[PDB]
Amino acid sequence: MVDAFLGTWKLVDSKNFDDYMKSLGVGFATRQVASMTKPTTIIEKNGDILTLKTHSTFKNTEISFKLGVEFDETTADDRKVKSIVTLDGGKLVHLQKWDGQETTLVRELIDGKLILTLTHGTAVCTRTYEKEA
Numbered sequence: 281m282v283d284a285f286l287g288t289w290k291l292v293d294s295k296n297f298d299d300y301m302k303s304l305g306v307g308f309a310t311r312q313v314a315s316m317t318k319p320t321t322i323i324e325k326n327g328d329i330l331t332l333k334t335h336s337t338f339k340n341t342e343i344s345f346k347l348g349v350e351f352d353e354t355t356a357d358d359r360k361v362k363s364i365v366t367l368d369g370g371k372l373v374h375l376q377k378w379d380g381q382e383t384t385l386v387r388e389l390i391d392g393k394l395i396l397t398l399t400h401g402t403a404v405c406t407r408t409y410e411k412e413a
């Protein structure tokens with residue numbers, strides 16, 4: 281059910297990422313470099329385990345998880361969070377919890393593109409990824 285998310289994806293558009301990062305308390309210098317970074321996201325499965333890599337010139341992250349099972353995560357901005365990823369309405373929904381705060385990272389396939397919507401507080405960022413051959 282996750283299979284159409286799998287593969288290598290490149291960022292092609294971003295809206296409001298600075299607002300999202302600022303809401304999370306990311307410092308201005310980190311925001312500045314992130315506003316110009318074009319990450320590559322790689323999503324692979326092996327049985328019930330998904331691995332999601334985010335690679336860039338700036339920061340790199342990797343998580344592995346089973347859908348519907350909580351995992352500890354250290355985010356790119358060094359937040360220590362409790363995470364869970366679920367499929368909901370065909371969307372891959374990643375919820376992070378820390379210090380009573382929440383943020384959602386929601387991925388949806390629209391016309392073969394991967395739309396990532398990042399919400400924290402009132403900030404809503406939309407990032408568009410396109411598949412690599």
Ligand SMILES: Cc1cc(C(C)(C)C)c(O)c(C(C)(C)C)c1
Nearest residue numbers: 310314319334336339355356357
């Ligand atoms: C500063 C910064 C913050 C984030 C989140 C806040 C989405 C975790 C992030 O994912 C990245 C890369 C996409 C560059 C890894 C950089």
